[PDB]
Each structure stands twice: as structure tokens, then as C-alpha cells.
A paper describes a structure:
Non-homologous end joining (NHEJ) is the primary pathway for repairing DNA double-strand breaks (DSBs) in many organisms, including Mtb, where it is mediated by the Ku protein and the multifunctional LigD enzyme. The NHEJ mechanism in bacteria is a simplified system compared to the human counterpart, as it is reliant on the action of only two proteins: Ku and Ligase D (LigD). Multiple studies have shown the ability of Ku to bind double-stranded DNA ends, interact with LigD and stimulate LigD repair activities. In this study, we demonstrate that Ku is essential for mycobacterial survival under DNA-damaging conditions.
To determine the mechanistic details of Ku-Mtb biding to DNA, we added a DNA substrate containing a 32 bp double-strand and 20 nt single-strand (SS), previously utilised for UvrD1 and Ku studies. Following data processing we subsequently obtained a map to 2.96 Å resolution, into which we could model a filament of Ku-Mtb bound to DNA. This filament is continuous with a minimal repeating unit of two Ku-Mtb homodimers bound to one DNA duplex, in agreement with our EMSA experiments indicating a stable complex of four Ku protomers with 1 DNA duplex. Within our cryo-EM map, we have modelled 1.5 repeating units (3 Ku-Mtb homodimers and two DNA molecules). The central DNA binding cradle of Ku-Mtb threads on to DNA, in a similar manner to human Ku70/80. Neighbouring repeating units position the two DNA ends at a distance of ~40 Å apart. Given the high quality of the experimental map, we were able to visualise density corresponding to a potential metal ion (likely to be Mg due to MgCl2 in the buffer) coordinated by residues His27, Asp26, Asp28 from one protomer and Trp169, Glu172 from another protomer, which is at the interface between two Ku protomers but not within binding distance to the DNA substrate, therefore it is likely that this ion has a role in structural stability of the Ku homodimer. We observe direct Ku-Ku protein interfaces within the filament, which is formed by two α-helices and two intertwined loops forming a largely hydrophobic interface. Interestingly, within the DNA filament cryo-EM map, no density was observed for the C-terminal α-helix, as identified within the apo structure. Instead, it appears that the C-terminal helix has been displaced by either the action of DNA binding or the binding of Ku-Mtb at the filament interface.
Residue numbers in the entry:
A (entry chain A), C (entry chain E), F (entry chain C): 1 to 229
B (entry chain B), D (entry chain F): 1 to 230
E (entry chain D): 1 to 227
Write the structure that this text describes.
DNA sequence: GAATGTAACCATCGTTGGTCGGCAGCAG
DNA sequence: CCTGCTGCCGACCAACGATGGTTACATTCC
DNA sequence: GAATGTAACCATCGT
DNA sequence: CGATGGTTACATTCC
């Protein structure tokens, strides 16, 4: 496990040096694109539509099109005009109860390890957040773009570990405009009664090891068959 | 809104025909490269390293490389040997308490709209899930790839809408192997109490329309002033 | 075979779309009356007693009669007041044992064909009904006049088909009030055995091909010979 | 209770005098039409669409319409040629186990009483059919039509009555031509196990008093309040 | 221009990552022993002057001898029981008034440079210290020795810089026992008036550019002729 | 309790003879390394390892690399050029209020005692400086060294004793002018109340008997138990 | 809109590179 | 009854090298 | 195009 | 000798 960000959680007088680790890793098998016959590697070569000429990366300019107003042709100077902020701060804004952030906001997950040997500041914040059950909304800038994020603490056995959840911006969520649910449908009490045993017949507790990506497992063994064959 | 999936939630007798809508959009501005001197669109041409010959898509083949073992080509026919997953039904596995699933599992969210002539099965299924405060661990297959997912219900004002959250497989979560937290630090109640005033001074309820993507807003308005000028 | 009803079996979570087919069709011949001297079809003309003139269907009102009363005028306005639903759902009430419904209750028979992309719900419901040997009591609603009905599964060889039997209401069966059977008559076992032997002498299994409508066949052959001249 | 048909049971050397009653009587309210302005009963007038004149019943004949086979006139000697069907005897043919006759077979039901002061023959026949559970397939003619019928014994407390069930001929029963049920599906034991509780949760015992024609009772109260309302 | 020690100031949940700089560097010319004829640096040899045995490093342990206790040896296992004091944080103990700390205790001074541009905590801590006018007594460890230190902010033009002064332990200051002052000596009130006029005669404000060192200035003049 | 330097204060019309005692002595235990088997005193040998010349104490000549290794030699002529500094008295330059001087140049402290039975001169000098709240800046001439020093008065209990502080030369103070300090960020008023509360929470009074060199104190105990054992 | 690649650049760990230290000799 | 002055030697900061990993983006499939 | 209603007749059990 | 319920066959708002 390698870190991807060495910064600090800062709000006012407070500053907690931490290192960010990616909490999740896609276990899907990733392939490569090769020529069918000679099995050589495949490279992508740019070609301008106007002249059919291969162009280098240095000759590219970002463009924006909106329905009709195509070819805005944004230059790199205009980006420099933007107040770019490649900050190294997890800037805490507020502290909200953990129940006020619903699951559809969460985007990604990251771990927080105390970077320095002085972990007292890290422990105190984690202990305070866990005891009072609050979550901190922060401005987390991973590499070049800033994203809304939430600071939460969860226990991995005997270890109290802080964690960062990238959040979707509130305007990024659509609203269900379905008129079907507006009308009222009458449900007899017996049907509500029946819906009980159906749920409790299949009801259980979340056991992680029951669920296995079957398609990936058989894909892995098929590859191993070719590897030995 | 345009649906992305038309099927049903089936776990036996129960079969609720629903349509899936993408709940979350993305407001980020998406650009596309153009030739600087020509302002012409850029196309990608595939070139094979072995011969330099331009390779059409039909003349491609997936390959997998991992340390020892080179040119491990996976042909199309082997994928056919794998049991295909074209399922158009959201197969329900079991029902778990809403709190038993951890927030780090969710990655994507979708809406469920009833599709049959009568929505009684959908409406009443939502009613019991909220009353029992339970989730539903399901198998969801959007486009030829099955993903573990969770079925839950949210209240959007007056409407009660079922919702699908795709989940990461339990083996996708790493363990925080940090020996630093293992060592124990001595603390006093004075600083422990003092941390209360620091946190509670900034404590507030989650207000959605207080956080804005300022960078996108500035970027968006810069586009228009360039668009009008020429 | 043409469908006479398209709906679904619904009792809560479960909703199995099906098509209803008439399981029995009488094989009689429907004769038409014609003029003796003209061979022309006759159309009945509605003649009112108090008017003596032909009255159209628009000017027709239903009346009820009971003893002293007689002219209880009923118009469709009161019919609208009375709840009347053409619900396209075969609502299920319970699952009684199969043997608990006496054959005197059955009135008509219908077939159920699955009418969905997947017939898993239909097939699995049929499988559990047969293995537990139970019968579902439903509220089958044809074109108005909701009727009590029973749902059962019968094997037509290699196909397992669900069927709907319309039932008369339990209050619709008369009471076999016979004073003669109330009194008892002495009978000796000696001649009881003789009655047993004659009964089993004629015993035979059910062969449906053994019985045919002989009179109707003679009627059948009569009018085709006349038709062919 | 009024007798519909009086006769006997044909057996060769055994005769069982008997009177027939209708086991069921529809309780639906029967309406008859009146003038919308005069409240007068309408009497149908038979007018043929070839002369515009009323026709006495002596001047019509039954005709068979079948495709191009029109103008088929059936006179008095045509239907007299068929043998007379009016018979006052219930001709038994065979004796079949009660489980062999299907529920789909039954059409109507009737009651039988001993139409004499000597009921020994009746109670004798019911006894053999009771202990040796069998059904007697008979030819039953009510007024002028001969229908297949099944004879069984049913008990009302301490009373044993033979009941005659009119059976439609086996050639009037259709065959389900559904290719959908021919194909087989993959089903899991978990799905079958789920079907148990849902069936068993709604499982009960057949109680006749639990079901009432709710529409009829609501309809029934409508006339009387109008009758009592003037 | 080099950070002798990089860490943070922590007094609980607060933590201010800083880098220290030596605030004072002596400008006196320092020499090293050189050979008049050989013109080569002299390297000392670890030779025991009791038996002639030539000794090398990584083989000799510390010793402590005084009065009655002689040849009391200390090895590398005895100091292992001593807890390591190599903590890389400046642990703030209290915040005493900035004026009550006696100038007797200061020996060395240091400069605190902020961390990367994430430096709001430093300016915040400096701002409050100047406002209520207090200094923080801390435990400062440079390499391995933990010394009592006082944290104080002070004004440098338009720049607010926090300085880590180091204090001698309170037990290192001797008690002045001067019996010559035990007797009470009467002071003439007229002399106090006489002294009052005397003190303002030479009352001159401190001008750092008024007085320079003379020994150092003269020595470099002779070096100019040689070079 | 041994005097280190005896002299007088040069004032013109005033001259107070005085003995000087060092105020503070470092209490860290000094260790001398000896042989593991011989326990001898390792006396370093000054033999130049460039030509094998055994340089004597008088043979040594201090050299400085300076700019480009110009290790110029110094003989008795040079020290003759500099004025003799064997004077055993110190002189006063100016009187500055104590508030003007700041403590980053203070390094050492020494006591002073009246050397004559006429102690009235000593106390009179002490009285006026305390009344004037000023510190006299002097040149202190220690063993073959002249340093800038600053008298001062301090009351130890009921005893009145003058004190000499030698100051580091003003030219020896570096300039910490960094652009980061020049760069100013925006401070909200919100955390100022929180920052002040945090500092005031841990505010206390300077009681010198609260801090001991616990590392050094308990090492003596280890030595005490090692010597006893 | 969804998966599925490629191709930029950035970032954290690695490890060779000079100071400034804290620990000891000598001056009648 | 002390104190100035240096190498036996030693932990402290930058400049490129490898390796993940993020971000952006076209190309297929509706 | 069946299912649903309703009137028409004659057979028929009850005196 | 008088009434009831059985087959007739007809006009409807239909998946």
C-alpha cells in the first residue's frame, strides 16, 4: 500500500499531518489490446481531421462545443487565469451528524494515517468525532481538482481509523419526477401483514463472505488454464 | 429523463417490472482535443508495434500480462465459454438491516420507476422496506457485467422512491495496516474535554445549498464571455 | 383459441400476468328461426304495452318486483352509486386444501396461460400448489359480476396448467330437506352383500371415449346430407 | 322446493323410484324491463325482415347457418326422424371411482328423494356407493335433452342423499395448446422453499360463511330503501 | 539557511508544523590547529597513557569517577533502560506571562519558519501570543537532549516571527549568599538626589550601529594585505 | 563559590572594587571515556599526519582557510599590533532603559560583590539603577577575551546584588525575513475566539519548581544504584 | 450513458549528497 | 577553589531515478 | 367475436 | 283442472 497524498487536516488553529491511502481497489481483471496475428502491442496515434497529419501532444488545445457554438478553443492561458488551487489542505468547513449524509452522496473512500510520529493530534480528533458521532465536511483536493468530501471515523477492530469519503456536489443529484408515485393506491392490512413473512423469510444479517464475484473467479481460472497450456 | 434499463425485481413469486434511471449526473465541463493550428477534430489511429500496420478494430484481441507468462492472448471464443450474464432481472439475495451495510461500500446510485400497469407491488414493497428499515442485497447487471448492489427506499418530499446502490465486492476493501494506531498514547481529560469546544464551535446541520463548485462556476462563466466575443 | 380476459393473479407482492381461455365449449348447434314462406331472419321488435309502439333501447329501464311492491324503478344513476369495479386482477383470498371444495360448487372452467417475458412466477406457483395439493380461492371478475372462483393446477400430460373454476356462492346451495330420510329403516347384512355384488359387477374405469352424444351425431349427419343435396 | 322430474333409476332388474330437485338456485336479482316513461312491460314482437309483418309461432322453422350453406329449412319430418328422447328412467352405464371424474367435468347438480313409502331400495344403493366409493355414470334426460350425468352419495349430517351431477360430454373440453409451458426453466431449491411460507401464510381452511356476494348485498339494500322510500 | 530540526509544536489537538533555524551565529573568527612547517591538519590518536595500548572508537564505554566513587563504569545496556527522548515535537506545557520570565535563563535562541503554504496555524498562534502577551514554556529536543525552552513571538518589521528561546533549568542558578550585604547600610537622601542627576547624564538610547566590535574589525584588516 | 575575576567599575568619579562569581553552572554530568581493561586517561597526541612532524605546544600556529585556503601564518608581531587587553577593569558606555533591550542576545550571567569595607558605594549604585529602571551597557574583559555586557540589578529575597549579563554582538543576529511571513492570508474572526480560548485554557503561572530534568535526574539514580551495586 | 481501453503528468518512496551540531582535550 | 577551544566523530537537508496512480479522453456499444 | 341479460314457449309437478 | 322452471333464441359496449 502506497500513499497518494501527504498533507494535513486544517481548520483554524488545528493542523493534523496525515497521509491518504486509497481504501478500495477494483479487483476486475484488466486486459491489454494487441494485434490479432503478430500479438504486438497497440499504440494510439493522433490524426488531425483537417489535414490527416499526425500531431504531437504539444499541438493539442482543449475545445468546448455546446449544441451550436462549437469550437470554443480554450487555450492554456485562460486556465492560468483561473485561480488554480493545488492545495495540500483538507480544509474543514463544518461538523455535521453522521446521519445527515445519505448514502447516494458518497463517491470514493480513502484512509488517513498519521504521517508524523506525533499522533496525539490525530487520535484526539478521531476520539472526539467517534464519541460525539459527527462528520466533518471538507474541501479535499486530491491531485488538481477540488471535491467535496466528508471526514468520518470507523473502527477496524482494535484500531480507530479516520477516513475520507468523496462526495457528489448537491446539484449533481437529479430528482425523481415520476408522476406514477403521486397517485394513491389502497393496500389492505392483510397485504401489509403478508409482506412481513416474505421479508423475514429471506431476512438475514450482512455477511460479507457469502458474496463472491463468480464471473471473475471463473475468468481467473480460465486465464490460468491458458497460462499453463 | 431517459431510462437505461428495463427489467424487473424477481426473487420467486415476486416480480415487479421497473425501469432504471441514473440518479447522479456530472456537471463537470467535458472538453475534446482539437488541432491547434487547424481547429480540427482529433481522431485516434491504432498502430501495432510489431509491424507498424494500422490495425482495424476487428483485427484486435484482448491480452493479459502478469509477470511471468507473456502474450497470454484471450480469444473471443473463450468468453463464450464463460457463462454469459444477460439477465434482465434484479435477482434479490436477502434482506439486511439498513445499518449493517457500511457507507464505504456504495459507489453508484440509480432510481427505480414502476413499469407495470399497476404499481401496487412496487408501492407495497417500498412500504415494508421502510417499516422494517432493511436493505436488499441484490445481483444487478447493467450491461453484460453483474455487480453486487443494494436496494433501499428514500423519501423525496411526498414521493417514496426505491433506489439501487451498486456496491463494491467485499474483497475490494483493503485493510488499514497502520502499525501507528497499535501503539497507545496517554491522554488527559483536560485536552479530551477541550476538543469538545473546538469541534462544537463549528458544529452545524448539513445544509445542501451551502457548498458550490466554485471552480466550475468560474470556468463556466469564462466559457460564455469567450463564446460571445468569438 | 382466443383470450377472453387479460389480467394478472395478484395477492400482494405476487403479480402473475396471465390470459384466460374458455376451457369448455358446448358442441350443440345454434339454429336460427326463419320465415316459413320467406326463409328470412327475424329481428325482435320491442313493443311497450302502455304505448303500443316500438321502443328503442335508449328508452329502457330495469324494474324490480316483489309481492306488494312491483314498480321499483331503477336507473343507471343508482347503479353508478353502487360500487362496481372491473378490476383486471384475480385477487386471491386463501389457499384451502384441494379436497375441501365439494364438486357441487364448480360452475365453469377456464385456462391460464402465462403472459409475461418470464413464466417463472407462473411455473413456480403451479409447482407449489400441486406439491402441497392446495386450492386458492379467488375473486374472479369477468365482464362485470365478480364471481367467487377456485384456482387449481392440472397436468395435461407433460404440461402443468393452472385453471380457474367459477364457484357458486355457499348460500346458493339449497337444503336437502327430506323427511323420509330422517326416519331409519332396518336392513340386514345378508341381502346387503347381494347389493354389493351387482354394483361391482358393472364396475369399470373412466373411458371418456366410451360415451358420445349419439343423438347429436344423428342430428349432425342429418343436416349435412340435406346441405349437400 | 318443487320437483323438476319424477321417474326411476334404470338397472335392468333394479328400479329405484325417485324425484329430482335442483341442488343450486342462483340468488342474483332478476330484473325485467319497463318503459322509461310509462313503466309498462315490453312484449317482444316477431317481425321478419322480408315482409314487415308479425309472425305467429306456427309460421317459423329452425334453420342452420354454416358458411355458404344458407336457406337450410328443417321441416316437421326431419326432427321427427330422430328417436324420441323423452324418457322417465335414469339409465346407468358403469361404476367409476369418485376420484376418476374431474372437477372440470361437472356442469350442474341435483338432489334425489325416495318417491315412495318404501325407501329400502334407495338407502340400499347409497350404502354400497358410500363404503365402496364409486360414481355411477348415467344417461339423464331432464325435459328433452339427454346429458351425461354422474351419480354420487353426499352426506348432510345423518342424511345420505344421492346427487346427480350433469356432465358435459368429454368432446366439449378443450386442450391447452401453450408452447410456453412446454419449455423448462431452471429453478432453485431456495425459490421453492420461499414458496412454502407465502402459501402457508395465506393457507387456511375452507369456511363457507367467510365469503359473501358483497355487490349483491349492497345492490339488495338499494331496492328496499327505494321501495320503502315511496 | 539550514533547518537543524523539523517538526511541530503540539499542545494537545493543536499542532503547528515548523522548521527551526539558529537565530544567532557568532561572527568571531574561529581558527583550527595547523602545522607551521608541515601545513597539515593534526589528527588526534586515541592512545591510553597508562599502558601504551592503542585504542579505537566503538570499544570504550563512559566512566564516572569522583571523590569516594572511582571507576564507576557505564555501558550501552545501562542507558538502554533510560527512555529515549528523541521526540520530534515541541511539547507546550503552559502559557506564563511574557514579562515574568527572568532574562537570567535565556542561553540560546532559534527561529521558527512555517511549513508549506498551509501555514494558517502559525499566523494564528503568533497572533494570539502577541495579543495576550504570553510565552509558552515547552520541552524542546534538538538531537537527543531535552532542554527547557520558552516560545515567544516578536516583531521584525512587517513580519511576525515566533522564536524558541532556551532556558536553563531552575536548579542551575546558584543562590547568592553574600554576608557583606547582611548588614544594613544607611544611604544619604541627598546622595539619592545626587545620583538622580547622575543617571540622566549618560542616559543614551540603545543604538546597535553606535557600537561595533574592535578586535574583529582590526584582525581582518591585516588579512587584506596578505590576500 | 570561587571568584573568577576581580576588578572595578570604571566610571570616572566612581570606582567600585568587586569580585565576580558565575551565577549559573550547568548540571549535566560530564563523562570521561576510559579503556575497558586499562581504564586509563586517553591523552590525545598532537602529531601532524601530513609530514610526521611532532608539533609542540609552542610550535602550533593557528590558520584559517578564509576565502580560497590562504592559510596565512600569524606571529608575535600581529598580537603586538592589536592593543593589549590585559586590563582588569570594565567601563560603562551608556544607560539604556531595560525595556529597550531584548533577550535574544543574552547568554551568560554573573554576580558581583563589594570588594571594600565601604560597601556604601556598591549599594548606592544599585539603588539608582533600580529607581531608573535602566541597564548600563559595558565592555566585559574576561580571561583573554572582551565581550559586550550589560549590568542590571536584581533582588534575591532581602539581598541586593548587582548582576552582569554579557550580550552576543548585534552583528551576530541573522535575518529571518522570509516571503512566507511577508505573504499575508485572510484570518476570520471566528477562530480568534476559539484560539484565545485554547490558549487561556492552558494558561498558568511560572513556578520554577514545576519542571525538573527527569531524564537527567533519574539517570543519577541509575548511577547511584550502579555505584552501590 | 455505459464499460474499456491509452496516454499524458503527478506523486510518494527510495538513496547519494554537506552542515552543524554535542561531546572532550588544555590556560597560572 | 575554574575556563576557552576543535574532530573521535555524528545526525540533520536536496537532485535525480523507478513505480504507482490520478485525470482526461476517445472508441466502441443504442 | 363470448359473456351477459331477458323474454318466449312448452313441459310438468301439484290439486 | 292452475303455477314453476326448463330450453329455446334473441340484442349487448368486447382482450
Amino acid at each position: 500500500m502506497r500513499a497518494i497524498w501527504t498533507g494535513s487536516i486544517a481548520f483554524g488553529l488545528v493542523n493534523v499531518p496525515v497521509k491518504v491511502y486509497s481504501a478500495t481497489a477494483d479487483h476486475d481483471i484488466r486486459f491489454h489490446q494487441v494485434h490479432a496475428k503478430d500479438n504486438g502491442r497497440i499504440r494510439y496515434k493522433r490524426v488531425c481531421e483537417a489535414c490527416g497529419e499526425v500531431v504531437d501532444y504539444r499541438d493539442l488545445a482543449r475545445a468546448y462545443e455546446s449544441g451550436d457554438g462549437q469550437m470554443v478553443a480554450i487555450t492554456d492561458d485562460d486556465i492560468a487565469s483561473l485561480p488554480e488551487e493545488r492545495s495540500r489542505e483538507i480544509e474543514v468547513l463544518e461538523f455535521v451528524p453522521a446521519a445527515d449524509v445519505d448514502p447516494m452522496m458518497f463517491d470514493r473512500s480513502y484512509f488517513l494515517e498519521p504521517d508524523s510520529k506525533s499522533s496525539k493530534s490525530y487520535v484526539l480528533l478521531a476520539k472526539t468525532l467517534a464519541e460525539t458521532d459527527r462528520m466533518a465536511i471538507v474541501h479535499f483536493t486530491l491531485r488538481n481538482k477540488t471535491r467535496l468530501a466528508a471526514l468520518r471515523v470507523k473502527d477496524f477492530g482494535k484500531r480507530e481509523v479516520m477516513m475520507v469519503h468523496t462526495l457528489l456536489w448537491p446539484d449533481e443529484i437529479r430528482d425523481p419526477d415520476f408522476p406514477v408515485l403521486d397517485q394513491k393506491v389502497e393496500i389492505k392490512p392483510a397485504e401489509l401483514k403478508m409482506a412481513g413473512q416474505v421479508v423475514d423469510s429471506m431476512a438475514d444479517d450482512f455477511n460479507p463472505d457469502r458474496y463472491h464475484d463468480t464471473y471473475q473467479e471463473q475468468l481467473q481460472e480460465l486465464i490460468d488454464t491458458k497460462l499453463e497450456g
